[PDB]
Amino acid sequence: GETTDGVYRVMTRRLLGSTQVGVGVMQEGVFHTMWHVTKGAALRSGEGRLDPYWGDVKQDLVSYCGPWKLDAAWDGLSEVQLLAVPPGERAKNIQTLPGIFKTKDGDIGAVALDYPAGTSGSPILDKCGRVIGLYGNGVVIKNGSYVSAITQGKRE
């Protein structure tokens, strides 16, 4: 199948027509997405198959064909870009200054941008174009607004 680096849609034909369930990143021959998008199931890419390699429900992340490769981190000061890939719509970069998720185990960057659930797995990038995490696991705040964590995996 196509293994060129880039952002990809994750589609399914189980439901009505072809539905976009999420998004992912292809980098160094490994496909990276959120666990809740595929539930760790195998994926098709043309006539080829992608098999899960690593996953973790608590991190809400999964990698296919190899170990998690993305290791860039938000610097805590600079604006970032969500490369949003919404269902049925063109890939579009949206710039924003991330907020903070304060937890008992440390602080995590957060992006306050509102997209359909099928946008889950869209990469958040730094000014160098490096993927600092994936969009789609977060919380619904008081005013019904959605705030996603900047979810990044560990590179062994």
Binding site: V10, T12, Q81, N93, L125
Partner: protein, 39 residues
């Protein structure tokens, strides 16, 4: 059965639309990967 379709390159876009705010929120993360607001 699920499949992937290329949507584009991963690049920074100069002069992209700038929006969203930067909230500081106290949160908890459970074993199921669900974030919740702490109050």
């Amino acid at each position: 059965d699920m499949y992937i379709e290329r949507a584009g390159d991963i690049t920074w876009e100069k002069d992209a639309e700038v929006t969203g705010n930067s909230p500081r929120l106290d949160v908890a993360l459970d074993e199921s990967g669900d974030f919740s607001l702490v109050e």
